[PDB]
Amino acid sequence: PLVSMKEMLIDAKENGYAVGQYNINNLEFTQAILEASQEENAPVILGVSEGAARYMSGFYTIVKMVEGLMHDLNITIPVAIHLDHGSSFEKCKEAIDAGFTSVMIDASHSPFEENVATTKKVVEYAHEKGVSVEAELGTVGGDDVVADGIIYADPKECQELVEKTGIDALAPALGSVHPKLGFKEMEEIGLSTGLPLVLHGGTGIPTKDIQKAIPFGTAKINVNTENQIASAKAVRDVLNNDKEVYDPRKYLGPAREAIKETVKGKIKEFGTSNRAKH
């Protein structure tokens, strides 16, 4: 069923696993992520950036497409449709009104008090529609910037944002780049806020650091470039080995397969397999 992130991330946090957010960019991306998660009996979060949504014509198109696939692929796992790095209240409202079940309102580059106000406004609207809300504090690093442009989430800011806004999940940047995670800080923030935590900039973080972060409260981990890299490699391989092929299905089919196998790998990493219940 289409659900928000709320209960799936609470279950993830409570039982020591994470649910991947896999970003979608078109039909084939969405098929691969849904099939992979269903085959793994795992809940899943479908991530949509604002740029990806423009590319896919709009939020409503995306929701329609997912509704189609839920039916045709016989999806029975929990599925959230999540606005990734939402830039404003208006954009969050637009996604929600089109049928999104979750939004991240990203005001982490604004003054903290403005982050609180804008996030609070998004939660008030979203919670009226059953939509879960993620917010962000701190900055993900990565040219030539001191401390590699890393700015840890402040534990007092984290606590205060949670208490004042009522968000369902928190993304505290704690050393990830786009690396050495502040596991001590992560533990403190998870315990103090009592919220499932979200990991951005996960691409390239070793499985061992990924699996250390998870019991410290990381319950959602974002995945995007890994799928793009794997799909693009499969397209290149098809086109480079057959100079005559033009049927889109003959290079985008393998791209879809490569995503599917990338996602199953992340699912195994994250412990998400067999967490979908009735």
Binding site for Zn ion (CB under 5 A): 200
d(CA 78, CA 222): 17
Q: Which is nearer to its own copies, 197 or 230 (CB)?
A: 230
Tokens of 182: 């502040």
Q: Which of residues 33-92 bind its own copies (CB under 8 A)?
A: 51-52, 55-65, 67-69, 71-73
Question: Which x/- pattern over 2-31 shows residues binding its own copies (rule: CB under 8 A)?
Answer: -----------------------xxxxx-x
Exactly one of 11, 84, 168, 209 is catalytic; name it. 84
168 catalytic residue (yes or no) = no
If contact means CB under 5 to 8 A according to the sort of partner, which of Zn ion, its own copies, none does residue 249 touch? its own copies
Q: Which is nearer to its own copies, 41 or 203 (CB)?
A: 203
Task: Check whether 85 is labelled as a binding-site residue.
Answer: yes
Q: Which is nearer to its own copies, 168 or 226 (CB)?
A: 226
Helix axes 27-39, 225-241, angle to 10 degrees: 110
Residue type, 219: A
Task: Check whether 157 is labelled as a binding-site residue.
Answer: no
Taking CB under 8 A as the criterion, the residue among 129, 232, 261, 274 binding its own copies is: 232
Residue type, 19: V
Rounded (10°) CA dihedral 135, 27, 44, 54: 10
Taking CB under 8 A as the criterion, the residue among 248, 261, 268, 274 binding its own copies is: 248
Helical residues (DSSP H) of the chain, grouped into ranges: 6-15, 27-39, 50-55, 59-72, 89-98, 112-126, 155-165, 183-193, 207-213, 225-241, 248-270
As to burial, measured by CB atoms within 10 angstroms (0-12 exposed, 13-18 middle, 19+ buried), residue 208 is exposed
The CA–CA distances, whole Å, from 36 to 164, 189, 260, 269 equal: 37, 32, 5, 14
Q: Which is nearer to its own copies, 147 or 239 (CB)?
A: 239
Q: Which residues bind its own copies (CB under 8 A)?
A: 25-29, 31, 51-52, 55-65, 67-69, 71-73, 225, 228-229, 231-233, 235-236, 239, 245-249, 251-253, 255
Annotated binding site for dihydroxyacetone phosphate: 201-203, 222-225
Annotated binding site for Zn(2+): 85, 106, 136, 178, 200
